[PDB]
């Protein structure tokens, strides 16, 4: 398969000379992509144009996942190649891959405000379309942290502000989960994003920030966005449970310094149970120093030291058991 590798590399490097060489020699992958895919991949408009017009290679070919070359150009953000594919090339802006993603999703997913701005206002792209997971282009820009793209998407399709993916995430949930504070302030201050809209499991954007350790987001939300750190998921788990359980000493300490209680969830487990069960020794210590009740039993009758013992976390058990026999 000597021909394939040379065409794909020449197309990707911008090597018009090799392309016209292979072609004249009558020589024109594993994922079913083509040299048109590789040209579009890094914005070699000249090679891509020669690849379609002169050598008559179709530009509507779909890779294994249904990605045509225009999807490729949008993901990688090379606007000039995408324009040629949609206008002259023969690609249609509403084309979906096998997941439902159009070129405007990809443009948002990989943060290319110019590709997004062109697609919305000159390209005819529909910003109300969901992928099979239920994601709007606005969900991608928020998760990516692309505030310029998000701005365009809020103006073009403002009802997307509180839209939920199939698992219940809003754009705010995704921004908070991913730690994008500027996007988070913009959705709440300027677009009246609801911060109490929960995912399917009962988690709020506050929990997502606590779960992933994004203290800057968590602090802004709790202070300036009418979210309370006593917020609970469907199991009664607080921001402090999620921080402790995933080892986020920064979030945990901030919560504890500004007054959040150390409370049991619906199952009787405190954030110390969660830290011990996941073997987060430093969180166990921070919670113990902040006066967590070491002997509190959950619904199964287990203390935090018990859970640490059962899940093999011997330094957590050792510590908690010895701090208790100190008292």
């Amino acid at each position: 398969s000597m021909a394939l590798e040379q065409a794909l590399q020449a197309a990707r490097r911008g090597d018009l000379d090799v392309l016209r060489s292979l072609h004249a020699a009558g020589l024109l992958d594993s994922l079913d992509a083509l040299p048109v895919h590789h040209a579009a991949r890094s914005g070699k408009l000249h090679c891509l144009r020669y690849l379609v017009e002169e050598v008559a290679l179709p530009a509507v070919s779909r890779a294994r996942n249904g990605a045509t070359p225009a999807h490729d150009a949008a993901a990688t953000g090379y606007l000039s190649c995408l324009q040629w594919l949609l206008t002259q090339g023969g690609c249609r802006v509403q084309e979906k891959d096998n997941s439902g993603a159009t070129v405007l999703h990809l443009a948002a997913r990989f943060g290319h405000p110019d590709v997004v701005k062109w697609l919305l206002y000159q390209g005819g792209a529909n910003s109300a379309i969901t992928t099979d997971t239920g994601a709007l282009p606005i969900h991608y820009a928020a998760a990516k942290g692309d505030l310029p793209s998000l701005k365009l998407l809020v103006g073009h399709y403002p009802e997307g502000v509180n839209a939920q993916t199939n698992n219940g995430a809003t754009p705010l949930y995704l921004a908070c989960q991913e730690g994008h504070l500027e996007v988070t302030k913009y959705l709440v201050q300027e677009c009246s994003a609801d911060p109490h809209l929960r995912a399917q499991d009962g988690m709020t954007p506050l929990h997502a920030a606590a779960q992933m350790g994004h203290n800057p987001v968590l602090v802004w939300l709790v202070s300036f966005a009418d979210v309370s750190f006593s917020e609970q998921d469907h199991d009664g788990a607080t921001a402090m449970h999620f921080a402790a359980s995933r080892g986020h000493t920064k979030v945990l300490s901030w919560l504890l310094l500004h007054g959040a209680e150390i409370s049991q969830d619906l199952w009787g487990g405190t954030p110390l149970h969660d830290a011990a069960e996941n073997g987060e020794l430093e969180c166990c210590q921070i919670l113990a120093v902040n006066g967590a009740g070491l002997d509190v039993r959950d619904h199964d009758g287990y203390t935090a030291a018990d859970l640490a013992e059962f899940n093999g976390h011997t330094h957590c058990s050792r510590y908690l058991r010895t701090v208790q026999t100190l008292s």
Partner: peptide, 20 residues
């Protein structure tokens, strides 16, 4: 809880820039 993702683990788009 689990983290909320928008896509599957397919690598076709991520492995399009020279980032793989």
């Amino acid at each position: 809880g689990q983290i909320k993702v928008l896509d599957g683990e397919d690598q076709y788009y991520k492995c399009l820039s020279p980032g793989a």
